[PDB]
Amino acid sequence: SIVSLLGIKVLNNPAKFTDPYEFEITFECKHDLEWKLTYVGSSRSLDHDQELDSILVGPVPVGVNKFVFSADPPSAELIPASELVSVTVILLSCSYDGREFVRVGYYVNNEYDEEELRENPPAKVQVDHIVRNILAEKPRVTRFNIVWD
């Protein structure tokens, strides 16, 4: 594996539901890498993936790299109201020429930023009061073996 993930630090955690996701990514060592962040929600009859953002990085600097990946927040209107205040998942992945070779999964908890809202949640979700908590210390890493050059 020419490109290996060495570390991921979630920089702004916890944060507002609408704050961008900020990952400090460290990886080691001709075609561009593509870093992707994907929102994954599970409701009763539906498993839905929503790509939150992506960044093409290239030429790939060789050796040990450290950079920050800033991903746009989710669009709440594309998400069932049930998932806005529940446990969900984000997937941070990287692809080399469109074939994924590493995927880092994180649990995400979402809840209201005030005790009154947590105990008496309104009928309509107030996204501006939702705080997300990424379980950043326990990544679920999957690595895929793939050809480079």
Epitope: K9, S42, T88, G105, Y107, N109, E137, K138, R140, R143
Partner: antibody, heavy 118, light 107 residues
Framework: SEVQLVESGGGLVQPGGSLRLSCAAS????????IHWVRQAPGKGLEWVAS????????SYADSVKGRFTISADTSKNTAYLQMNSLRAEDTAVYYC??????????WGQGTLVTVSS | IQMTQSPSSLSASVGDRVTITCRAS??????VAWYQQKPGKAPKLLIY???SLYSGVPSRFSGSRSGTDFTLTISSLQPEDFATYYC?????????FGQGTKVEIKR
């Protein structure tokens, strides 16, 4: 390149005693993956006991072993460990170590038997 | 933080369609995996993320999720399939296994 996990260190220990299990990894770096210990009492089901996660070395433990067991990983020796203190009879089981595959476990060792008895 | 697996034992024949279910505590499909175990051997991974087939596993194995119910289906039971099967939930703080399903041969 062949991926293998080999447990060692099992055997007979008295109640209240300590025992250090080893999980020798080959074919991958033990620090780039989550490593887990899962035990199986004679004739019983699977019971997870401990996990360690990459990058930070954060750990998770089942309630029945919290405090008594400590999981760790040494990158130079490419080996993970399960330090078991204050052992009890109910800790008798075959102990497997396994490698994390996302939220799952893709490679498992052969398991090492731990018997706690006087 | 609980997995209730059923049935606990099932007798079937080669070629049968077998359905094993686990009711989980959460509906996150990423967190659920299915394993097969034979006596004196380590468990083997069959299904991960509720419905993804692990490499090398035959296509007669499949997994699904309905609410908090997770189901493993074997479409055409083969002689090497008679074994015990376990579901797993890798939760926020604890990893939980189902009690297991022992699939035996009817005769």
């Amino acid at each position: 390149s062949e991926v293998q996990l080999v447990e060692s260190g099992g055997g007979l220990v008295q109640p209240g005693g300590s025992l250090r299990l080893s999980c020798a990894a080959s074919g991958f770096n033990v620090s780039y993956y989550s490593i887990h210990w899962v035990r199986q009492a004679p004739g019983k089901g699977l019971e997870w006991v401990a996990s360690i996660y990459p990058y930070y070395g954060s750990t998770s433990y089942a309630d029945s072993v919290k405090g008594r067991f400590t999981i760790s990983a040494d990158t130079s020796k490419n080996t993970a460990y399960l330090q078991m203190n204050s052992l009890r009879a109910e800790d008798t089981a075959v102990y497997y170590c396994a490698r994390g595959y996302g939220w799952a476990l893709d490679y498992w060792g052969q398991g090492t038997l731990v018997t706690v008895s006087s | 933080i609980q997995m209730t697996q059923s049935p606990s034992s099932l007798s079937a024949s080669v070629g049968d369609r077998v359905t094993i279910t686990c009711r989980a505590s959460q509906s996150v499909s990423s967190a659920v995996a299915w394993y097969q175990q034979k006596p004196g051997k380590a468990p083997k991974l069959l299904i991960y993320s509720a419905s993804s087939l692990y490499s090398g596993v035959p296509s007669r194995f499949s997994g699904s999720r309905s609410g908090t119910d997770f189901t493993l289906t074997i479409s055409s039971l083969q002689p090497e399939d008679f074994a015990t099967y376990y579901c797993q939930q890798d939760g926020w703080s604890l990893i939980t296994f189902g009690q297991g399903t022992k699939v035996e041969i009817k005769r």
